[PDB]
């Protein structure tokens, strides 16, 4: 058996089943596995990427690929206009969050 390379934040876990079926989620992970740079980088986040999944409605997923361990961190998932533009203080906190989390997991 192999340990999973995918790691869900509490927020993502809270929201995943709403936006994706298990089958769709499996395919999304498989796409990420093959192409970890699948999404586009969100500026000033230290490499967080943003990807839209077509699926109802389309979903956006935010993730970070930790290159060192080849492991994926799934931040959050949302529909159109449920998230907002970040400012400096928020990018600061978000990067610290990624870090802290990365170090607990």
């Amino acid at each position, epitope marked *: 058996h192999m340990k999973s390379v995918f790691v869900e934040s509490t*927020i993502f*876990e809270k929201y995943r089943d709403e936006y994706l079926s298990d089958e769709e989620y499996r395919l999304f992970q498989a796409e990420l596995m093959l192409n970890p740079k699948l999404g586009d980088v969100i500026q000033g986040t230290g490499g967080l990427r943003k990807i839209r999944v077509a699926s109802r409605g389309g979903s956006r997923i935010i993730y970070y690929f930790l290159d060192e361990k080849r492991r994926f961190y799934l931040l959050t998932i949302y529909g159109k206009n449920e998230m907002s533009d970040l400012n400096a203080n*928020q990018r600061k906190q978000l990067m610290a969050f990624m870090e802290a989390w990365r170090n607990e997991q």
Partner: nanobody
Amino acid sequence: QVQLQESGGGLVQPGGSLRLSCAASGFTLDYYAIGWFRQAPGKEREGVSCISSSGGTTNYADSVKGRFTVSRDNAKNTVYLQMNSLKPEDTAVYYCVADFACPLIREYDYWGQGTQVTVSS
């Protein structure tokens, strides 16, 4: 199953106090920002307060500023809202969210059933 558990509500006289609790269930809230919004019947959701994971950053809505104090205890997995000088305008059900930063990034959404706060004579 992850959720936030709100408690500490109740009825109080004008000028009175209450302390509200937001306790994570099914996860650890240490690294997350937490915020409060409230909803009264016939009113839209209105943001109340928010706090960063380290506690070094707090936010308050204008109409509660000065009166409310938000704090957290990470070892206890709980966030608090100290409400002082309560006004009838503060009557509402209070709800807790978890997020990546303070100020909040995501639009308000329910993490629990909330706690009722009534201030009246």
